[PDB]
Amino acid sequence: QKYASIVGVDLLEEITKDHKVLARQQLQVLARYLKMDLDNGERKFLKEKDTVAELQAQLDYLNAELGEFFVN
Amino acid sequence: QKYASIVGVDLLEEITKDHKVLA
Amino acid sequence: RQQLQVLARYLKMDLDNGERKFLKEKDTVAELQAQLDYLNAELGEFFVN
Known part of the structure; x- marks a missing residue:
């Protein structure tokens, strides 16, 4: 816009899905060729969790x- | 159609061929 | 393997049709022959031949 002000010159998909699934x-x-779990990166994420709720349920x-005064 | 009657609320490719041949 | x-799924390409033919070509044969x-x-091979 600055250049034009300084000069003056104004003015379907399914093809993919398959192309994905493979x-x-x-x-x-492939993972089987290496035996590489793609879910361990979540199960941790869930056991880190269930332990939390209870961790908190205690808290x-x-x-x-007792009370927030006592505790804090 | 039954739910509407009960409630009342009516109313290019060559990209692929190549994407195949290699397969 | x-x-x-x-891949076949990407093309929906049966790898067994090349056998089912090979089996129906067959079951039809046995019976074809069982008649024969x-x-x-x-009758006898003399008659027939």
Whole structure:
């Protein structure tokens, strides 16, 4: 816009999905060639979690029984 | 159609061929 | 052996039709023959030949 002000010169898809799935497929079969779990990167993420809820469920019993004044 | 009656609310490719041949 | 088959899905290319033909060409044969030998049994190879 600055250059024009200074000069003056103004003015379907499914083709893909398949093109994906094989990748999505050749993906997994490869893992078998290396035995490389693509879910361990989540199970951690879930056990890190279930342990949390309970970790917390403890933590809030206290704030409920004792009080945030006491605790803090 | 039954739900609407009960409620009342009516109303190029060559990209592929190559994408095949290699396969 | 795996990337093989999954590819087929990208083209939907049966790798067994090249046998099912080979089997129906067959079951039809046995019976085709089972007829043919009843005759040689009932009539005789002299008659037939």
